[PDB]
Design a binder for this molecule. Sequence first.
Ligand SMILES: CO[C@H]1O[C@H](CO)[C@@H](O)[C@H](O)[C@@H]1O
Ligand SMILES: CO[C@H]1O[C@H](CO)[C@@H](O)[C@H](O)[C@@H]1O
Ligand SMILES: [Ca+2]
Ligand SMILES: [Ca+2]
Ligand SMILES: [Mn+2]
Ligand SMILES: [Mn+2]
Lengths: 47, 47, 180, 180
Amino acid sequence: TSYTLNEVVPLKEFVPEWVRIGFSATTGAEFAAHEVLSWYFHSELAG
Amino acid sequence: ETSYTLNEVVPLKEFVPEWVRIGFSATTGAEFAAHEVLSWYFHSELA
Amino acid sequence: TETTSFSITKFGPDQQNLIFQGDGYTTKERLTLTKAVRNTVGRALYSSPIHIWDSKTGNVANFVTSFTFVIDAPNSYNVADGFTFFIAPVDTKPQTGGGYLGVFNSKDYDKTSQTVAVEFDTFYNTAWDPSNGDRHIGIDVNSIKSINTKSWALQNGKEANVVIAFNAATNVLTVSLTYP
Amino acid sequence: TETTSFSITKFGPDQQNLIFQGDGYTTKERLTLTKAVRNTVGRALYSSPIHIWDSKTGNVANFVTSFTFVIDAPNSYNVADGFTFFIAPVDTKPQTGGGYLGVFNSKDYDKTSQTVAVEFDTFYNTAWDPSNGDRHIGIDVNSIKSINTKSWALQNGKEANVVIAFNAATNVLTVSLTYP
Ligand SMILES: CO[C@H]1O[C@H](CO)[C@@H](O)[C@H](O)[C@@H]1O
Ligand SMILES: CO[C@H]1O[C@H](CO)[C@@H](O)[C@H](O)[C@@H]1O
Ligand SMILES: [Ca+2]
Ligand SMILES: [Ca+2]
Ligand SMILES: [Mn+2]
Ligand SMILES: [Mn+2]
């Protein structure tokens, strides 16, 4: 079962030149355990 | 086409912590020279 | 040219290449962002800064990330708030908890936030979520109010594999989640 | 399985994924560790800790690194002190300058050092360097006195391409320096 979403987001208008990436999760009045099992990342920036 | 190779068995697990930082250093003392790095590529894989 | 790449297939007890914030920590070879307890936040950041664009050339990076995650709720009705993958300033710290997912503070566009997140939202917050009340995948830039959303049916305790990719030439951010 | 990778084909003035120490800085597309100036120490570290071996399993990592560097001196006679690629604890700080190359403090073995360095040494320090007085590539573990060295002729002002590889199956560290 898959779900796909695509959007144009010109990142350069929104984030600084240098960023840290990561995951976030919260609970509030209601809750669930949130867990990541594996993670691969790759970025490339031409110069 | 001028090359210099040195090989040596170094059981790193005996000398260094599990988690390390890697990098470069250079120094001058009473004599000197400019020491510059133009590019750097690294890849490690731990199973 | 600059590239940064890494992969972690199994999380150890001391995963020193991650910055943990809030209650995030690693356990049973998983990164646990929250336990099943009320009112918590957990974040984990890769330790190296990533160069996403450069002002002297104007070039912008492509990137790809994929991860598998599990949301484990008691029953599929008592579940909140969700999970995010985000891109933020190097000094990012936990923001508001609850339905703001630890990443934003307002439904009002805040240019000083300069964080974009792809959220996997499990709880409908009437003030900003899609009116239909569904769980959804959304793309957020500078507010908790997604610019766009796709309804998603949570499969509780099931692993979801997601790929998120951004291509600088077309500025297109592509999100894909699959339950295998 | 854990992997860490990066390349910086060209250093810019704002290289935030490097930690700079002593007088090392980045300029004119170059990382400069030292200018041609007396009495300085410059170091640069990659910002992410890397997992080189694991005590839970006893596995150790394979890694390879490549870099190209330039030593530029007034003339070929008065050249000092050298350049190192090193591996050290996460909280590593500059040690003694001059002949100790910023990474060690003694010619005596000290297991508290926990540093191994591959050095490209251009000045002959009679207390520990090869008695032939030759410029040399050396492998240092916990002391500035190399456990093995190879003579190298400096081509002053020319760039050298270095590849260092470690193979965990055999524990062999291979170093090759090539001028065009
Ligand atoms: C009902 O409000 C509280 O709980 C929900 C669900 O957890 C969160 O969205 C919200 O921000 C508060 O924590
Ligand atoms: C004369 O001794 C000094 O200068 C040389 C050459 O720079 C260094 O090797 C040494 O550590 C001292 O600083
Ligand atoms: Ca919500
Ligand atoms: Ca020397
Ligand atoms: Mn939402
Ligand atoms: Mn030496």
